[PDB]
Design an enzyme around this catalytic site. Structure first.
Site, mmCIF file in Angstrom:
data_model
loop_
_atom_site.group_PDB
_atom_site.id
_atom_site.type_symbol
_atom_site.label_atom_id
_atom_site.label_comp_id
_atom_site.label_asym_id
_atom_site.label_seq_id
_atom_site.Cartn_x
_atom_site.Cartn_y
_atom_site.Cartn_z
ATOM 1 C CD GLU A 44 -83.121 -57.078 12.731
ATOM 2 O OE1 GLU A 44 -81.600 -56.780 11.623
ATOM 3 O OE2 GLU A 44 -83.155 -57.825 13.445
ATOM 4 C CB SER A 70 -77.179 -58.273 7.636
ATOM 5 O OG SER A 70 -76.885 -59.456 8.540
ATOM 6 C CD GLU A 113 -89.838 -59.039 15.602
ATOM 7 O OE1 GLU A 113 -89.797 -58.981 16.666
ATOM 8 O OE2 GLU A 113 -88.758 -59.552 15.584
ATOM 9 C CE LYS A 137 -88.133 -61.940 13.689
ATOM 10 N NZ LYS A 137 -87.375 -61.148 13.649
ATOM 11 C CD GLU A 151 -87.602 -56.527 16.198
ATOM 12 O OE1 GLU A 151 -86.570 -57.082 15.458
ATOM 13 O OE2 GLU A 151 -87.093 -54.922 16.448
ATOM 14 C CD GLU A 205 -75.400 -54.248 36.842
ATOM 15 O OE1 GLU A 205 -75.016 -52.804 37.188
ATOM 16 O OE2 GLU A 205 -75.216 -54.267 35.440
ATOM 17 C CB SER A 247 -80.737 -61.425 6.507
ATOM 18 O OG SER A 247 -78.835 -62.457 6.540
ATOM 19 C CG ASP A 248 -83.942 -61.158 10.600
ATOM 20 O OD1 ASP A 248 -83.064 -62.239 11.400
ATOM 21 O OD2 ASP A 248 -83.257 -60.282 11.138
ATOM 22 C CE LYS A 263 -75.989 -67.647 37.233
ATOM 23 N NZ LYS A 263 -76.864 -66.480 36.542
ATOM 24 C CD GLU A 315 -75.470 -63.306 38.138
ATOM 25 O OE1 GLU A 315 -76.609 -63.300 36.736
ATOM 26 O OE2 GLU A 315 -76.092 -62.315 38.734
HETATM 27 N N1 LIG Z 1 -87.961 -54.929 39.458
HETATM 28 C C1 LIG Z 1 -89.342 -55.920 38.958
HETATM 29 C C2 LIG Z 1 -88.825 -54.765 37.444
HETATM 30 O O1 LIG Z 1 -87.325 -55.346 37.260
HETATM 31 C C3 LIG Z 1 -87.028 -55.084 35.538
HETATM 32 O O2 LIG Z 1 -85.912 -55.575 35.116
HETATM 33 C C4 LIG Z 1 -85.852 -56.893 35.054
HETATM 34 C C5 LIG Z 1 -84.475 -56.751 34.152
HETATM 35 O O3 LIG Z 1 -83.953 -56.364 33.359
HETATM 36 C C6 LIG Z 1 -83.279 -56.607 35.353
HETATM 37 O O4 LIG Z 1 -82.178 -57.736 35.100
HETATM 38 C C7 LIG Z 1 -80.685 -56.181 35.280
HETATM 39 C C8 LIG Z 1 -80.267 -56.374 34.903
HETATM 40 O O5 LIG Z 1 -81.104 -55.043 34.026
HETATM 41 C C9 LIG Z 1 -79.215 -55.643 35.557
HETATM 42 N N2 LIG Z 1 -77.605 -54.219 34.454
HETATM 43 C C10 LIG Z 1 -78.037 -56.468 36.413
HETATM 44 C C11 LIG Z 1 -79.186 -57.583 36.856
HETATM 45 N N3 LIG Z 1 -78.015 -58.531 37.681
HETATM 46 C C12 LIG Z 1 -80.094 -57.515 36.774
HETATM 47 O O6 LIG Z 1 -80.861 -58.961 37.045
HETATM 48 C C13 LIG Z 1 -81.708 -60.022 36.507
HETATM 49 O O7 LIG Z 1 -80.948 -60.584 35.502
HETATM 50 C C14 LIG Z 1 -79.774 -62.142 36.217
HETATM 51 C C15 LIG Z 1 -78.980 -62.892 35.266
HETATM 52 N N4 LIG Z 1 -78.944 -62.045 33.876
HETATM 53 C C16 LIG Z 1 -80.580 -62.317 37.487
HETATM 54 O O8 LIG Z 1 -79.490 -63.176 37.745
HETATM 55 C C17 LIG Z 1 -81.210 -61.339 38.254
HETATM 56 O O9 LIG Z 1 -82.255 -62.489 39.816
HETATM 57 C C18 LIG Z 1 -81.822 -60.818 37.901
HETATM 58 N N5 LIG Z 1 -82.976 -59.789 39.125
HETATM 59 O O10 LIG Z 1 -84.081 -56.956 35.613
HETATM 60 C C19 LIG Z 1 -85.559 -57.066 36.363
HETATM 61 C C20 LIG Z 1 -85.815 -58.656 37.738
HETATM 62 O O11 LIG Z 1 -85.783 -58.445 38.408
HETATM 63 C C21 LIG Z 1 -87.834 -53.933 35.125
HETATM 64 N N6 LIG Z 1 -85.952 -52.829 36.062
HETATM 65 C C22 LIG Z 1 -88.811 -53.420 35.537
HETATM 66 O O12 LIG Z 1 -89.990 -53.301 34.711
HETATM 67 C C23 LIG Z 1 -88.797 -53.583 37.331
HETATM 68 O O13 LIG Z 1 -87.931 -53.070 37.903
HETATM 69 N N1 LIG Z 2 -86.653 -48.737 19.137
HETATM 70 C C1 LIG Z 2 -86.099 -48.032 19.470
HETATM 71 C C2 LIG Z 2 -85.563 -48.556 21.359
HETATM 72 O O1 LIG Z 2 -85.895 -49.784 20.878
HETATM 73 C C3 LIG Z 2 -85.389 -51.297 22.145
HETATM 74 O O2 LIG Z 2 -86.095 -51.815 22.247
HETATM 75 C C4 LIG Z 2 -85.007 -52.745 22.368
HETATM 76 C C5 LIG Z 2 -84.694 -53.860 22.004
HETATM 77 O O3 LIG Z 2 -85.496 -54.167 24.136
HETATM 78 C C6 LIG Z 2 -86.052 -54.704 22.186
HETATM 79 O O4 LIG Z 2 -85.844 -55.867 21.480
HETATM 80 C C7 LIG Z 2 -86.905 -56.548 20.024
HETATM 81 C C8 LIG Z 2 -87.336 -57.124 21.745
HETATM 82 O O5 LIG Z 2 -88.781 -56.184 22.284
HETATM 83 C C9 LIG Z 2 -89.051 -58.040 20.632
HETATM 84 N N2 LIG Z 2 -89.040 -59.051 21.522
HETATM 85 C C10 LIG Z 2 -87.928 -59.246 20.021
HETATM 86 C C11 LIG Z 2 -87.321 -57.947 18.634
HETATM 87 N N3 LIG Z 2 -86.336 -59.263 18.277
HETATM 88 C C12 LIG Z 2 -86.266 -57.400 19.690
HETATM 89 O O6 LIG Z 2 -84.958 -56.745 18.674
HETATM 90 C C13 LIG Z 2 -84.117 -56.533 19.207
HETATM 91 O O7 LIG Z 2 -83.389 -58.028 19.389
HETATM 92 C C14 LIG Z 2 -83.226 -58.491 18.739
HETATM 93 C C15 LIG Z 2 -81.546 -59.955 19.418
HETATM 94 N N4 LIG Z 2 -82.152 -59.894 20.440
HETATM 95 C C16 LIG Z 2 -82.207 -58.326 17.003
HETATM 96 O O8 LIG Z 2 -82.209 -58.846 16.448
HETATM 97 C C17 LIG Z 2 -82.683 -56.948 16.840
HETATM 98 O O9 LIG Z 2 -81.983 -56.221 15.681
HETATM 99 C C18 LIG Z 2 -82.914 -56.241 17.467
HETATM 100 N N5 LIG Z 2 -84.062 -55.076 17.524
HETATM 101 O O10 LIG Z 2 -85.682 -54.108 20.499
HETATM 102 C C19 LIG Z 2 -85.075 -52.506 20.559
HETATM 103 C C20 LIG Z 2 -83.721 -52.482 19.439
HETATM 104 O O11 LIG Z 2 -83.792 -52.297 18.262
HETATM 105 C C21 LIG Z 2 -86.949 -49.894 23.748
HETATM 106 N N6 LIG Z 2 -88.571 -50.187 23.105
HETATM 107 C C22 LIG Z 2 -86.845 -48.690 23.931
HETATM 108 O O12 LIG Z 2 -85.695 -47.704 24.326
HETATM 109 C C23 LIG Z 2 -87.043 -48.199 22.003
HETATM 110 O O13 LIG Z 2 -87.914 -48.271 21.102
HETATM 111 MG MG LIG Z 3 -77.724 -61.654 38.637
#
Ligand SMILES: NC[C@@H]1O[C@H](O[C@H]2[C@@H](O)[C@H](O[C@@H]3[C@@H](O)[C@H](N)C[C@H](N)[C@H]3O[C@H]3O[C@H](CN)[C@@H](O)[C@H](O)[C@H]3N)O[C@@H]2CO)[C@H](N)[C@@H](O)[C@@H]1O
Ligand SMILES: NC[C@@H]1O[C@H](O[C@H]2[C@@H](O)[C@H](O[C@@H]3[C@@H](O)[C@H](N)C[C@H](N)[C@H]3O[C@H]3O[C@H](CN)[C@@H](O)[C@H](O)[C@H]3N)O[C@@H]2CO)[C@H](N)[C@@H](O)[C@@H]1O
Ligand SMILES: [Mg+2]
EC number: 2.7.7.-
Lengths: 253, 252
Positions: A52, A39, A67, A74, A76, A141, A49-50, A149, A145
């Site tokens: 960023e 924002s 962060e 706050k 980030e 996905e 607002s925070d 549910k 799903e």
């Molecule tokens: N598999 C082990 C680890 O998983 C991580 O990712 C995790 C997470 O982002 C990822 O999320 C994936 C997405 O991405 C993908 N685009 C759709 C898919 N349905 C979703 O699946 C996940 O979220 C669902 C709920 N929304 C759950 O119902 C489902 O059981 C869960 N596996 O599933 C993984 C957990 O199972 C990393 N890929 C990597 O650190 C390593 O592979």
């Molecule tokens: N920075 C560019 C890219 O960011 C990616 O991660 C993305 C995403 O996971 C990550 O998410 C991070 C988290 O992790 C962390 N634990 C809390 C933090 N508030 C959250 O931030 C994000 O999600 C918030 C809402 N939930 C948004 O409000 C915020 O604008 C957004 N930066 O923020 C990044 C997006 O800005 C990967 N790190 C990498 O591909 C590369 O560094």
């Molecule tokens: Mg799933």
């Protein structure tokens, strides 16, 4: 800790400027660019607002964040190498309409040579096939799903999950609409308002959003009927737009 | 028109067909195959999907196959052992929602005790890791949500308040889950299980009642209940020692 407190655009930009100077003091010539997003980057920040910020680093493989809160506000700050940030900016996940507005809301405050413009150009140059693939994945996905549910809820409960699930489905539908129209939503608060203003929506989406936006989520039978109507609308909409893969095989690999 | 109703027996037949396909296609690169989720717990319901995890020998292997047949849906994750073990030991803000996977593994193929190693890694996370995750959750999620609903109070839009209240209730459930080091069994039971725990922040149970009942249309009441929960958080962290650093203006 009773914050966040009310702040003005000065107050935020003064804080932004202090952080910018600290970033340049600490990392020096390794900083290629510093931008404000969210924002504040759009100059539409509200009282609470925070803050960023995004930093492009010259350092190979740089990828870290800071962060924190002061109790009253706050911040980030993300630090990425150019290659890591550009790779992320060109990736289209199911929540692209929610996450990549960042790259269309950059307020440049430091740039040693066209880096923030390159980030923007990368985010806006994603090819059509990438969005097509992301939409087909979202249907499987997320939406399929969710349909399982709520049908489980219909037959075995718990209805106490139905309001939350209905909110999730409305949000996933908004992601579908954003991917289809290649639009990123301005804020989290405006996602549904902006989604229902788009054209060529799957049938039933408007009615579903009416429940979610009004907060009248207590009539489980009406919610289930609305979810089923939207699910039927998804089937006709994806077929009409060609977001269809062959599903005839039990195992497609 | 799917998903359709299926029985556990039918789901397990599908799982074993997929197991045979994975072994045929990837051969000696397969270290282990397990079922997780509701089917892995043997509590799958009429419409549940099928979720499987594979451990691969290939270094850096990290891919998935996720599809439907029109009638049911399958997700199969393929990971190298280190990638999976690393993920199993990480505690993010949604650990109580995501890592139930590792406490619901039904092994169907295993060439060397690999799925047991995954379970042991997931269950051996140290107390400090949960402490750090709780402090991060307060700053990164709850503080952010507070700014969002306070913005709604002064400038709208109230049409976001039902969705935001659902998000806050879920974040509170993650906080409770991290504190008690518990993973919720299913997506549907997160809120019901959270409010039954001890040591709840004051106002959390009352807030969840709006979300579980679906009575989310009284905007003044939701805002008052969100503020009460936020105040409850401030005591709760003091009582349990989850102190967030607010001393640095810029912590670098
Ligand atoms: N598999 C082990 C680890 O998983 C991580 O990712 C995790 C997470 O982002 C990822 O999320 C994936 C997405 O991405 C993908 N685009 C759709 C898919 N349905 C979703 O699946 C996940 O979220 C669902 C709920 N929304 C759950 O119902 C489902 O059981 C869960 N596996 O599933 C993984 C957990 O199972 C990393 N890929 C990597 O650190 C390593 O592979
Ligand atoms: N920075 C560019 C890219 O960011 C990616 O991660 C993305 C995403 O996971 C990550 O998410 C991070 C988290 O992790 C962390 N634990 C809390 C933090 N508030 C959250 O931030 C994000 O999600 C918030 C809402 N939930 C948004 O409000 C915020 O604008 C957004 N930066 O923020 C990044 C997006 O800005 C990967 N790190 C990498 O591909 C590369 O560094
Ligand atoms: Mg799933």
């Amino acid at each position: 800790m009773n914050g966040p407190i009310i702040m003005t655009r000065e107050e935020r930009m003064k804080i932004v400027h202090e952080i910018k100077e600290r970033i340049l003091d600490k990392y020096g010539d390794d900083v290629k660019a510093i931008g404000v997003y969210g924002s504040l980057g759009r100059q539409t920040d509200g009282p609470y607002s925070d803050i960023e910020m995004m930093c492009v680093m010259s350092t190979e493989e740089a990828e870290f964040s800071h962060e924190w809160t002061t109790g009253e506000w706050k911040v980030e700050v993300n630090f990425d190498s150019e290659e890591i940030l550009l790779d992320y900016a060109s990736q289209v996940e199911s929540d692209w309409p929610l996450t990549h507005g960042q790259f269309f809301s950059i307020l440049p405050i430091y740039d040693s040579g066209g880096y923030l413009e390159k980030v923007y150009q990368t985010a806006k140059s994603v090819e059509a096939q990438t969005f097509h693939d992301a939409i087909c994945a979202l249907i499987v996905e997320e939406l399929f799903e969710y349909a399982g549910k709520w049908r489980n809820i219909r037959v075995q409960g718990p209805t106490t999950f139905l309001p939350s699930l209905t909110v999730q489905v409305a949000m996933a539908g908004a992601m579908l609409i954003g991917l289809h129209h290649r639009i990123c939503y301005t804020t989290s608060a405006s996602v549904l308002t902006e989604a229902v203003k788009q054209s060529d929506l799957p049938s039933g989406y408007d009615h579903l959003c009416q429940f979610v936006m009004s907060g009248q989520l207590s009539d489980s039978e009406k919610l289930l009927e609305s979810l089923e109507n939207f699910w039927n609308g998804i089937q006709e909409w994806t077929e009409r737009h060609g977001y269809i893969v062959d599903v005839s095989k039990r195992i497609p690999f």
